Amino acid sequence: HHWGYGKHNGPEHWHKDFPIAKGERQSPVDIDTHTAKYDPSLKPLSVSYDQATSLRILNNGHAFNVEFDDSQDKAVLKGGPLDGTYRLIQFHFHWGSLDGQGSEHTVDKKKYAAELHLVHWNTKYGDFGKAVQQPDGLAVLGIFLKVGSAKPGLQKVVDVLDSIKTKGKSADFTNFDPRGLLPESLDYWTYPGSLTTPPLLECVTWIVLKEPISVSSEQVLKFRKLNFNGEGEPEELMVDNWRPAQPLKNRQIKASFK
Numbered sequence: 416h417h418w419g420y421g422k423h424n425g426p427e428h429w430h431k432d433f434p435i436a437k438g439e440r441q442s443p444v445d446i447d448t449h450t451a452k453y454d455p456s457l458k459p460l461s462v463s464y465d466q467a468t469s470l471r472i473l474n475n476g477h478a479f480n481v482e483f484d485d486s487q488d489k490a491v492l493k494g495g496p497l498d499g500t501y502r503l504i505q506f507h508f509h510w511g512s513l514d515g516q517g518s519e520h521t522v523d524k525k526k527y528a529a530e531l532h533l534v535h536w537n538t539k540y541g542d543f544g545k546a547v548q549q550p551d552g553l554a555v556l557g558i559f560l561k562v563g564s565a566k567p568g569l570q571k572v573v574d575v576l577d578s579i580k581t582k583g584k585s586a587d588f589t590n591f592d593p594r595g596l597l598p599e600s601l602d603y604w605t606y607p608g609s610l611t612t613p614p615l616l617e618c619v620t621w622i623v624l625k626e627p628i629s630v631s632s633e634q635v636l637k638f639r640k641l642n643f644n645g646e647g648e649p650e651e652l653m654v655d656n657w658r659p660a661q662p663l664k665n666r667q668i669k670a671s672f673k
């Protein structure tokens with residue numbers, strides 16, 4: 416027993432072990448597209464994933480992470496609101512029990528079927544563990560998923576999920592190209608926030624893409640076959656692993672586009 420997304424250990428409970436849950440820069444938030452400020456001074460995002468090296472896929476009991484070799488500058492995010500260089504460590508998703516919910520960020524209160532998080536750490540801090548302890552330690556690129564046409568670049572991920580059904584299971588996952596998960600446009604909103612799960616540390620520059628990607632009904636259905644539990648423990652489907660929108664408080668969301 417620990418934090419999760421159930422009746423008894425879900426988002427409304429987290430503050431009791433992680434008091435920063437009620438902090439001043441918590442994520443996710445609703446993106447009010449009409450209050451967001453266009454900043455013509457924001458640089459284009461630079462996503463350089465051509466040399467990415469995926470290693471493994473892991474069911475951690477809260478989601479599944481596709482992990483990368485982050486020991487060199489092989490897959491990096493720069494530009495936009497960011498100073499310096501951020502290294503890709505892993506990506507994961509949050510999703511719903513139904514197509515009408517699943518995203519963590521919302522857009523004018525709209526919820527998408529899922530949300531992809533590509534997690535990067537600021538190389539000036541040397542590694543991920545040190546980066547999460549810093550106010551500008553992480554840059555998370557968030558991408559919304561809507562149900563429609565299939566995303567061919569997602570299919571290799573979908574097909575390996577059968578081998579990591581339960582908490583603690585991992586599988587080799589090499590040569591996966593995260594460029595296949597991106598939409599056409601790199602137009603984005605950006606704001607200062609936090610990890611959306613415990614420990615909820617306020618270490619994230621959020622960069623959320625305006626353009627969702629489309630995935631098929633069958634692709635998201637396969638996410639919903641995963642389990643929160645370990646093998647041989649009672650089966651609970653890994654669904655609705657999203658935190659709802661948190662108060663914006665003293666924050667402005669910026670937009671890269673008019």
Ligand SMILES: N#Cc1ccc(-c2ccc(S(N)(=O)=O)cc2)cc1
Pocket residue numbers: 416417418419423424425428429430431432433
């Ligand atoms: N049986 C049982 C049982 C049910 C719920 C908990 C629990 C643990 C951690 C948290 S949290 N989210 O603060 O970390 C919340 C609830 C423990 C045991």
Ligand SMILES: N#Cc1ccc(-c2ccc(S(N)(=O)=O)cc2)cc1
Pocket residue numbers: 532534547555609610611612613614
């Ligand atoms: N130890 C540890 C430890 C556990 C979990 C994370 C984490 C990373 C990204 C996110 S998110 N959903 O904001 O992209 C949430 C949590 C970091 C450190």
Ligand SMILES: [Zn+2]
Pocket residue numbers: 507508509532611
């Ligand atoms: Zn996430």
